[PDB]
Design an enzyme around this catalytic site. Structure first.
Site: not given
Length: 191
Positions: A17, A22, A68, A70, A95, A116
């Site tokens: 990914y 992203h 991650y 967070n 993004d 986030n």
């Protein structure tokens, strides 16, 4: 005097990914590190990796998180204090689902439109309103999940224009140092 530009790229090392829609946040960092010719080294403390250099006339610190969503938010906090940051400016590429794929939206601090990292990093330091880089990812999907649509990096025209927009994104990031904010965004939206 000796104040650096704090560049946080919203792009965690993910085998597959890291090559998808992203990767926008990581692109600017990787490209800047690429043109300078330096790799980011592991800061054995928070688990994040940072590379040092000079853009235009200011020290540039390219920091990317461990993993991650967070975690990425609180990644910036202990790191900024770690090397003791003189507040010049903080740039966080991320993004943006509301903006057309290929173009850059420049806002001061925190705001809706992203997921986030952009929101988390603001509270991690407590100081915002500088340059929050929004790279348009296209538009919200009609069938698949909005975030899943960002997990699939395929499009018609702009899918080929990725290298172009990324080089310009990273390049305009340096312009934010030399020029400022208003004439800079003017340059970005002139093409």
């Amino acid at each position: 005097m000796a104040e650096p530009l704090l560049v946080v790229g919203l792009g965690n090392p993910g085998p597959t990914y890291a090559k998808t829609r992203h990767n926008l946040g990581f692109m600017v960092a990787d490209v800047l590190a690429g043109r300078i010719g330096s790799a980011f080294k592991v800061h054995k403390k928070s688990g994040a990796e940072v590379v040092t250099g000079r853009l235009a006339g200011t020290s540039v610190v390219l920091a990317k998180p461990r993993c991650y969503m967070n975690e990425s938010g609180r990644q910036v906090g202990p790191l900024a204090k770690f090397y003791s940051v003189p507040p010049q400016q903080i740039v966080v590429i991320h993004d943006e689902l509301d903006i057309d794929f290929g173009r850059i939206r420049l806002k001061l601090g925190g705001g809706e439109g992203g997921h986030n990292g952009l929101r988390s990093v603001a509270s991690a330091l407590g100081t915002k309103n500088f340059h929050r880089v929004r790279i348009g990812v296209g538009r919200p999907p009609g069938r698949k999940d909005p975030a899943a649509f960002v997990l699939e990096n395929f499009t018609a025209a702009e899918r080929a224009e990725v290298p172009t927009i990324v080089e310009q994104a990273a390049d305009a990031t340096e312009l934010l140092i030399a020029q400022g904010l208003e004439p800079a965004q003017n340059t970005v939206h002139a093409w």
